[PDB]
Design a protein around this ligand. Sequence first.
Ligand SMILES: CCCCCCCC/C=C\CCCCCCCC(=O)O
Length: 131
Amino acid sequence: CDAFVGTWKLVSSENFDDYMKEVGVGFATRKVAGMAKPNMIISVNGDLVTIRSESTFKNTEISFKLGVEFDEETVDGRKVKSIITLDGGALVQVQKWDGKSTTIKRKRDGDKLVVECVMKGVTSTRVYERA
Ligand SMILES: CCCCCCCC/C=C\CCCCCCCC(=O)O
């Protein structure tokens, strides 16, 4: 997960609003949340990985052990159970809440960090470049 370490900047987003809507995010949040060009800061300390997202709207931060389920309060306000594992070079995150589930995969693609989100078939792709 050292290949993910660093600060990243959003450079392109595709279908993110559709994803949020499939997730159930409210109109206001979707608008403000989508307005953003958040920075993602990933760091590793021992077996604890931290993924931070910063923007003018809201900052988020989760610290976890890969493979151990934990509580996460998403940027849109959901309180979910997340599990993040390292598979094939990608960080695969699954969030579960109110009987629903969504997958967020973070992978390295060339010199970029690509975030793919999936909810009920609706998928969004966000590309980040080193800040
Ligand atoms: C309202 C969105 C809820 C889902 C948030 C998780 C998005 C994961 C995918 C790509 C990283 C996007 C940047 C992090 C979200 C913060 C957005 C913000 O408020 O600036």
